[PDB]
Amino acid sequence: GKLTSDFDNPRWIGRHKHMFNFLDVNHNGKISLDEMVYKASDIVINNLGATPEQAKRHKDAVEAFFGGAGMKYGVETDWPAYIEGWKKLATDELEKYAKNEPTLIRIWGDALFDIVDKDQNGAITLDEWKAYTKAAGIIQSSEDCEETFRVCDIDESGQLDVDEMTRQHLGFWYTMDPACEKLYGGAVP
Ligand SMILES: O=C1c2cc(-c3ccc(O)cc3)cc(Cc3ccccc3)c2C[C@@H]1Cc1ccc(O)cc1
Known part of the structure; x- marks a missing residue:
């Protein structure tokens, strides 16, 4: 694995700058927590049919x-x-990874996969991953959704669970692990 940050890497800055511009849908140069939690809750409630209990759990995790x-x-x-705030988030997440403490990215995945997985067993199929990422807009093409299941160590079903995705997200959002490249296909640089 990799538990060292790489905040001076221009491709780490560019990865989150891509996300920032993707999240700033009204081109205001600034985004709010109201907007992020609304987008997140709108997806699971109005696109994925989350129950109020599931939505509340998912809301607290995104928040x-x-x-x-x-x-x-x-x-x-x-x-x-x-x-600047994302450097503090990655630093806090890396401290949780090291302490074998539940990270914020794992807690979001667990809450989310309970909604995305129709069997509610913490493992989603490729069609369910296409359903979520296209509703979120983070991935547009089905080709980029398939790259996720190539990068991730899928189980024998084969479905993607939060354990594997938390491992991939560690290197993709936080540490710039070369092995975690193309986790969202070509949709996220
Ligand atoms: O990880 C994920 C991530 C990271 C960012 C991001 C990234 C970098 C930024 O700088 C800003 C936003 C953005 C998104 C899209 C999104 C944004 C706001 C509201 C709802 C969805 C997603 C999903 C996906 C959800 C997930 C979480 C844990 C799992 O185990 C599996 C799936």
Whole structure:
């Protein structure tokens, strides 16, 4: 694995700058925690049929995750404060990884996969991953969705679970692990 940060890597900055511009759908140069939690909850409730119990769990997880990057309700976060807050989020997540503490990215996955998995067993199929990532907009083509199941160590079903995805997300969002490249296909650089 890799438990060292790489915040000076221009491709780490560019990866999250891509995400920031993807999240700033109204081209305001700034995004709020209200917008992020709305987008997240809108997906699982209105596209994926989450129950109120599932949605509340998922809401607290998304709220914590983006809140870990310094975003707050009623506050607009511009790009400089965004990437600065994302360094603090990656640092806190890397401390949790090292302490074998439940990370914010795992807690979001567990809450999300309970919705995305129709059997609610913490493992999603390729069609279910295409359903979520296209509703979220983070992936547009079915080709990029298939790259996820190539990069990830899929089980024998074969489905993707939170254990494997948390491992991939460690290297993709936090440490720039070369083996975690193309986790979202070509949709996210
Ligand atoms: O990990 C994930 C991630 C990271 C970012 C991101 C990335 C970098 C940024 O700088 C900003 C936003 C953005 C997204 C899309 C999204 C944004 C806001 C509201 C709902 C979805 C997603 C999904 C996906 C959910 C997930 C979580 C854990 C799992 O185990 C499996 C799936």
